[PDB]
Amino acid sequence: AFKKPLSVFKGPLLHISPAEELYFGSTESGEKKTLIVLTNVTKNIVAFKVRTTAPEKYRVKPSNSSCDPGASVDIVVSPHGGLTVSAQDRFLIMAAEMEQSSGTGPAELTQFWKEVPRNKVMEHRLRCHTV
């Protein structure tokens, strides 16, 4: 509920917190987690996907979804039990703006990503800080 304050990267479609570096903290059960917050600063829905250099290592929720105009979405990232964060581990936020009144169900998002020209796709990288 209460979270550490985060820096901000201002992209054209999204503001992203933190701006560049992900720090992990412990939960009540001792598990390590970090938070990414995306804020859609456009007038239309923005579709987004989260990718990583270590796809077997992290739970990422949500990772393929959409953000409403003016709204924020929390993305929770945590290494699987027994795995430890490396400074080599990076995340990629990919995002693109949809049309007015676009649907955002899974099939609709899949079709959108097939159509969107690469030049319209915003990308921003984040890097893990060791624990």
Tell me what the structure shows.
The protein is mainly beta. The protein has one domain: Immunoglobulin-like (Sandwich). The chain contains 1 helix and 11 strands; from the N terminus they run E-E-E-E-E-E-E-E-E-E-H-E. The chain has one helix at 106-115; strands at residues 9-10, 14-17, 21-22, 25-26, 32-40, 46-52, 58-61, 64-67, 72-79, 90-97, 122-128. The strands form 2 sheets. Strands 1, 2, 4, 5, 7 and 9 form a 6-stranded antiparallel sheet that branches. Strands 3-11-10-6-8 form a 5-stranded mixed sheet, covered by helices on one side. A hairpin with a 3-residue loop joins strand 1 (9-10) and strand 2 (14-17). The chain is globular, with a radius of gyration of 15 Å. The two termini are 21 Å apart. It is classed as protein binding. Keywords: Membrane contact sites, FFAT motif, MSP domain, Endoplasmic reticulum, protein binding. The assembly is monomeric.
| β-sheet strand percentage | 35-45%
CATH superfamily: Immunoglobulins
In DSSP terms (H or I, runs of 4 or more residues), the helix count works out at: 1
Order of helices and strands: EEEEEEEEEEHE
PDB class: protein binding
Keywords: Endoplasmic reticulum, protein binding
Assembly: monomeric
Entry title: The crystal structure of the MSP domain of human MOSPD2.
Topology summary:
Layout (H helix, E strand, L loop, with lengths): L8 E2 L3 E4 L3 E2 L2 E2 L5 E9 L5 E7 L5 E4 L2 E4 L4 E8 L10 E8 L8 H10 L6 E7 L3
Parallel strand pairs: 3-11
Antiparallel strand pairs: 1-2, 2-5, 4-5, 5-9, 6-8, 6-10, 7-9, 10-11
